[model samples]
Target: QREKWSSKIDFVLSVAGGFVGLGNVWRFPYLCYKNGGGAFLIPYFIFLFGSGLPVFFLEIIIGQYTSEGGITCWEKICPLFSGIGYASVVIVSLLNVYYIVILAWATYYLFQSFQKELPWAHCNHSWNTPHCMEDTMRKNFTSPVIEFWERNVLSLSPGIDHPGSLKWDLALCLLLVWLVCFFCIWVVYFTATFPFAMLLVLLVRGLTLPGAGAGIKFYLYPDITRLEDPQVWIDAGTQIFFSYAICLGAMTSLGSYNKYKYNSYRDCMLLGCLNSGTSFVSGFAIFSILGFMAQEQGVDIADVAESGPGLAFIAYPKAVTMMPLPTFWSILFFIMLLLLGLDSQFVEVEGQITSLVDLYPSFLRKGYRREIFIAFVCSISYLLGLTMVTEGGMYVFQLFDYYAASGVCLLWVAFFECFVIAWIYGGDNLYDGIEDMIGYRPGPWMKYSWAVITPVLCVGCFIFSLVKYVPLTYNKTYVYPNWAIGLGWSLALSSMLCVPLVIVIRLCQTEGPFLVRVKYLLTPREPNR
Candidate 1:
């Protein structure tokens, strides 16, 4: 029997579990604050509806109607675009390989939280450089926490080309990360809900802290002028794209488990909104603490409001130490991170595994065989992750983050996804299928979004990202050398190349006249019997 979700709630929670993760917790807050504070919400919600929800709904319907994993779902939709599915698996696999390094960092922090004093709290640690300073107010001196990240956990190298010696601490943490990931390979329903608890706790705690109001104000206060900048909208679209986990195969894999008649359109709308809501709410918790950090340091809020690992590893930890009962809050915050990351990691690995099993079910069929397969995948992933554990691993990590999970990569995948489903395979047929499954029809906005708006926004953002592309840097200090930058481009092209490669292969192999082949390639496959 085909594996199916134990219940509709399980499926919903699993999808939501994946969509709402580190991106929501660490990335969104910084993007919101930097991109114009409150003004960012305007394009954010606009894209959420116009682009995010529509594609989300599309993927759900595609999987539910076809009842197949990422690869075969597209095979059933339009065989020529089956590469879209392959591309999704490859992108997410790349994502999982690097993404878990963040979890490894979180795990490192999680254990550090148990100490009487947090390791990153003061400048006294063995890892502290002469440049490290304990005074929070001094902007020039490197924060103690940041030093710990660089000098201790990462042992950061000078550049990407140098595969510096491995940081044994991080390698151990990486092992722990893979172990936790293996046990949680199946996304649990409770893990999805637990982060909200921690977020609420953090929000309340952060608000109670001194100078929190300024941070919240910075987060909410709108800069309408930002609307004029195309980069803001590009960021909004990219945020929506990543936040919803579209084009990553996770959503498609989750949807494949739905009961044949499940109301996935409604699930798509409901969960999509909820994911954005989590991002909106998480901003308050993150920035309020960041606000406190800035105030504690006697610096401007903008000075401390960094994104990505800087915000999570450095800024947040600094803020936590200044609060009363720092250990409690630190533990709570890092645990939240652990839980949040575990949920997302579960889905990412699951998606890749699901797609492979679906494509070759005979070999990877259920029970011990699948268990062994999952172990193999995680083991290989862990071994691959060792490169990022090197002294230069931080540089390598930044490269993966820039190329694998970058806006350009996601936008490229989305542009083709929208095109294949909305133009090549036919939007009406897909919508008809969605309506048939759900016993309800989506409105014109949904149709137009899939057919027109989403693709246009994706292409616009993709090109804009390329035009303004900056070389990858770690903490804005060490710029990647030209050779490393070339490698990053190759990483991006690795996923994107799959689409055109498959199209060419299909064209060459199909037994028909050139025009007939072109016509057939553009048509949808008959739904699986």
Candidate 2:
């Protein structure tokens, strides 16, 4: 039998831990301003209620009812669409590879704080390369944080600086990376509420900070015209994917561990609302601090903010340099960020581990097998992830995102999931299954919502994303050469191709008569067994 959580609170908090991740802090805040500032929320909430929550409930209720990992569970529901699990797993695998490198950096950045001095404050560092300046020496000074990030962390070396060198230093440090995290883990409960408290404290500080309103205004300043562009709506959808941790199978895997007869519907709404609520409120703190940065720099918020990836680290670290007890705040900031990074990190990989265990239960369920699998999992990722650890790693990193179906896989699985539940499996059947488990029924609207709103909006965003697509361009100058672009295309199709290919192979498994076999194939194995 699948192990259930200790209590509903534990499950809910754990779900919160997974859903309210670094995405809330890094992604949503910039995504807000990136997609026409405040105007973006319309598209955000549109999907949140339309597709997001309905699907969020769909993912959880299915897992709770089935008690199987995402892959096995989907297969149980409909063998033809077993590829839903694979599609989800494929994207989860990509994330597992890309995600840990972020933890590596947060760990690296944190250790630097044990120093008697911080590196990003002074203009004289060897990494500064003459561009660094002092406030008094120049009016347009480059903050040491900006230069330190590019010069040291990224090394910003142009060209595919491939096998030419390795980040053996970062790799070596990251080698022992997971060990350190597992050992030092848990600021739990006392800290579960800490970041929420921390965010509000920052909000108060921001309200009082001089020029903070500049960012707050830019943050809330609705560029209503920007919404007319189809791209902004899709950008909002993408964040819903990232911020909600959907289509990665993490949600499904998390839900699989819940006890039967739990009040999961309430948990679903609470968790879903809390996820978006944190995302909506997080902007107030992010922009408020950025406004202070803009004010300090003698520039408009426009000049200071550009929705850059890692803008939070760059933006917030700049705040430390300008404030008192720089090293102290440096340690404090990274400590919180590090804490936030890890729980979600493990939860993500948990989705993958659970998939393997479900697949190979005869082996993985016995003795030290699961631990061995975990080790091998991390080792494999370490070797492959080393590619992104090169001086050229950042390009490969961007390339992973530019090419991968990480987002595309999201909509694919989401739309297919709703179809499987509401169409293939029957919406009334789903409502019946959920009602049986929860001891009550929801309104009729949920079934129709899953049937209509979720699937339709999912495709809407997916199509819009493609319509606005262009060849990957970094810094608006370098067009990824044709072959590289082809590879990117290959990566995108790889995850999506799993769905149809698996269908053909699975169809070949059963007896004759194609039309009738679909029904037979769709039935759960329990009936046949």
Candidate 3:
């Protein structure tokens, strides 16, 4: 018996804990800035009303109704649709592997933050004079196989002065960062101890940094024009799902462990608030840094601020270096980021692990054996983490990050999931199931959101994202070695395929009484077989 979360609050926080990651810390703030500033909020709220929250409630209902993990929940709900959930697991796991490396990066940056000066600022030019950025990634360290980069690449120095090459000292620090994160994860699978609390405290400290206030202005200050753009709606929808981790079935898996009688309506509200709150609080921590950078770079707050990796690696670290108490601020900020990543990774890792436990109940019961299994699973993940520690590892991580098979495709599948559940499988039955589990009939608003708005918005985003989506890093600019890209796509496709395949396999594999039982259960007339 893997322990369920101790309470509704625990479950919701833990689930949100998994969903909110580094992206929330810096990504959302900058995205809001980039897209429409204050303007993004309009479409964001619309998308949330129309898409994010409903799907959130839907997945919760499915998990609570089925009381199963990712693939298992889909299998119970409708064997035909099991593939969608299964693919999500694969996407989460592949992303989880690279996440460990990111955890490492955050940890390293935090430690450097404690030093007297921000290391990334070239505070100590003593350690890194050769300027490592320009070296073809292979040549930057000690690798010998890729001299072509030496011929074609421009060398970079430390700090903003040298943009391309990574310094030996920072590189060393990065290695240590990876090791520390691996160790934190290794100890008890994130927040198993003081790190969680430590993260919160560090977050408070980050707010006090000299340049921190500037970051705050950047995040919340709204660009009124963006509110009018249609793209802002789409961007907000995508951000909420990503920010809340709602699209991924990881929430359902973790949420499934809740007591059958648990109040889902309350839980949904709690999760919704928590998810949104984290985004807001993270904005405070992140935007202050952004503001500081604006002041230093002598540009409007908008010029120096960036989102995604640009904010995490380039902008923030550079700002930390220039600060009066650079070391302390850097440590607090990075530590906070690491904590966020750790929590996110925990939910993601736990989601997959829990699904595995559900699949094979015998091997991992709640005991020393289960603990051992957690260790074993984490160990396997660590090996995967090591694969990412290579100079070229970032490439591998990037590939999976972009094209996880069913991840991007989930909108299409979700459209079908809602259509099947609400239309074909019987919406009335699902409503009853919700009432059974939560003790209240969904109101007309819930019904409309689920039946009409949810699927349409999901389908709409999927279609628009397909058309409007620009590749984060296209093949034209920087290509992954073909094999790595192949592997990445394979991992994504494989995860997505497994759930559907398993459903079909199971349907065909069982015979006689079991087959009959499944048949009866799946029939249109039987709401509760």
Measured on C-alpha atoms, candidate 3 has an lDDT of: 0.58
Tens-place lDDT per residue, model 1, 1-529, is 5567898877877787788888898777756755676778888888887889888888877777888888888777888878888888888888888888888888888887888888888896788877777755464577787788677767767777888787788789989989988886733646666678878877787778888899888888878897767667776777888888888888888888888778877777888778878888878877788778777777777776444355767667776776788999888888888888878888889889988888888889666689889999999989888888888777777778767865577888888888887887778877787778888887888789988998888887677666775555555567678888888888888898888899899999998899999878766667743
**Superposed model 1: Cα runs more than 4 Å off:** 32-40, 136-139, 186-189, 222-232, 305-308, 366-368
Q: Which candidate would rank higher by lDDT, 1 or 2?
A: 1
lDDT of 3 at 202: 39
Top of the candidates by TM-score:
1
Clashing pairs in 2: none
Error of 3 at 300 (Å): 5.8
C-alpha TM-scores of all predictions: 0.93, 0.92, 0.73
By lDDT, the candidates rank as 1, 2, 3
**Per-prediction CA RMSD (Å):** 2.4, 2.7, 7.5
| lDDT for predicted candidate 1 compared with the true structure | 0.79
Please give, for residues 232-324, the per-residue lDDT of candidate 3 as tens digits.
Answer: 655676666666665467777876777776778776866676667666665565556556555544556555533333345555555454446
Model 2 C-alpha lDDT per residue in residues 390-467, reported as the tens digit of each score: 776766766675445345567777889888888888888878888888889988767888889888888887887788
Residue 508 CA displacement from its true place in model 2, Å: 1.5
Candidate 3 RMSD computed on C-alpha atoms after optimal superposition onto the true structure: 7.5
Q: Candidate 3's error at 383, in angstroms?
A: 3.3
> Which sequence of candidate numbers ranks them by TM-score, best first?
1, 2, 3
Range of the 10 consecutive residues with the lowest summed lDDT in candidate 1: 303-312
